[PDB]
């Protein structure tokens, strides 16, 4: 519950687009971890059916 809530907090911590049912956000992440994050994005979205 604590985690889902935190997730929800972040989801509120977003910009809701109008043209797409997609959220776009400004996110700052370390260049060092840029590959790590791109692989993480792949894993996250890969679980999802879309």
């Amino acid at each position: 519950v604590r985690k889902m809530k935190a997730i929800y907090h972040t989801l509120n911590l977003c910009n809701i687009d109008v043209t797409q049912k997609c959220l776009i956000a400004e996110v700052w992440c370390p260049v060092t971890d840029l590959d790590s994050i791109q692989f993480a994005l792949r894993r996250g979205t890969e679980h999802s059916g879309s």
Partner: protein
């Protein structure tokens, strides 16, 4: 290119909006057509029943 990806998506949204509005316009058109065709069918039905009546008489 962020602004452009956004604009391209907005264009897709615009098309979607157009596609359903046009579908609703067609619906209205199809309904009027339905009424006119119905009446045309009624006229054919009428002719057939008129013929049956005269045959019977």
């Amino acid at each position: 290119s962020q602004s452009q990806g956004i604009q391209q998506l907005l264009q897709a949204e615009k098309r979607a909006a157009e596609k359903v509005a046009d579908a609703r316009k067609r619906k209205a058109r199809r309904l009027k057509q339905a009424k006119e065709e119905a009446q045309m069918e009624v006229e054919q039905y009428r002719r057939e029943r008129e013929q049956e009546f005269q045959s019977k008489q």
